[PDB]
Amino acid sequence: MNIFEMLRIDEGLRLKIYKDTEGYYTIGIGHLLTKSPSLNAAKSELDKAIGRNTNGVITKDEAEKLFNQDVDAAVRGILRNAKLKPVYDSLDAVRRAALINMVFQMGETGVAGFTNSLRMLQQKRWDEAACNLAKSRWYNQTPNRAKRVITTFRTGTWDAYKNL
Numbered sequence: 001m002n003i004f005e006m007l008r009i010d011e012g013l014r015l016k017i018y019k020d021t022e023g024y025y026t027i028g029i030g031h032l033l034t035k036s037p038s039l040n041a042a043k044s045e046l047d048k049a050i051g052r053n054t055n056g057v058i059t060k061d062e063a064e065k066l067f068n069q070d071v072d073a074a075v076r077g078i079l080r081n082a083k084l085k086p087v088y089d090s091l092d093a094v095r096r097a098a099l100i101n102m103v104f105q106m107g108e109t110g111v112a113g114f115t116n117s118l119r120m121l122q123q124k125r126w127d128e129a130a131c132n133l134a135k136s137r138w139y140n141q142t143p144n145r146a147k148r149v150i151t152t153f154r155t156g157t158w159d160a161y162k163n164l
């Protein structure tokens with residue numbers, strides 16, 4: 001297991017524009033296109049992202065290209081953020097992946113806002129952190145995915161991703 005395999009499990013792979021869990025136009029391996037309700041706006045975002053006039057459909061290689069960029073953007077976002085960088089630096093490789101996962105799904109700003117959870121993580125109070133993380137819109141809206149990420153923070157193992 002690694003961050004790519006983890007996120008691939010959590011985000012799936014779809015080669016045609018589809019609506020994510022929040023009803024937002026997405027493609028590939030959880031590549032958010034726009035929050036706009038306009039399919040045309042989403043298609044324009046796609047074309048710009050890929051560098052060609054798509055028919056709202058991409059190849060597996062193109063999906064994986066955007067995925068690589070998105071993982072890199074999540075890491076870059078953590079490292080540039082004053083709240084997230086110290087937490088990330090304090091974590092082991094497995095838990096770092098769990099943090100990258102959260103950033104991929106909700107963005108740098110969103111995760112940086114989890115002040116209490118971040119403190120418990122930095123403190124290495126794993127069970128306390130896990131309970132605190134569950135008290136969120138994030139957990140309520142995507143409970144199976146959040147449960148997997150939380151288990152990863154609680155244990156520092158890939159147990160939540162092994163049967164998957």
Ligand SMILES: *SCC1=C(C)C(C)(C)N(O)C1(C)C
Nearest residue numbers: 127128129130131132133134
């Ligand atoms: S992480 C959720 C938990 C709560 C809120 C109580 C106190 C019921 N627990 O025993 C857990 C730690 C499972």
Ligand SMILES: [Cl-]
Nearest residue numbers: 011012020030
């Ligand atoms: Cl998805």
Ligand SMILES: [Cl-]
Nearest residue numbers: 048049066069
């Ligand atoms: Cl992009």
Ligand SMILES: [Cl-]
Nearest residue numbers: 142143144145
């Ligand atoms: Cl879920």
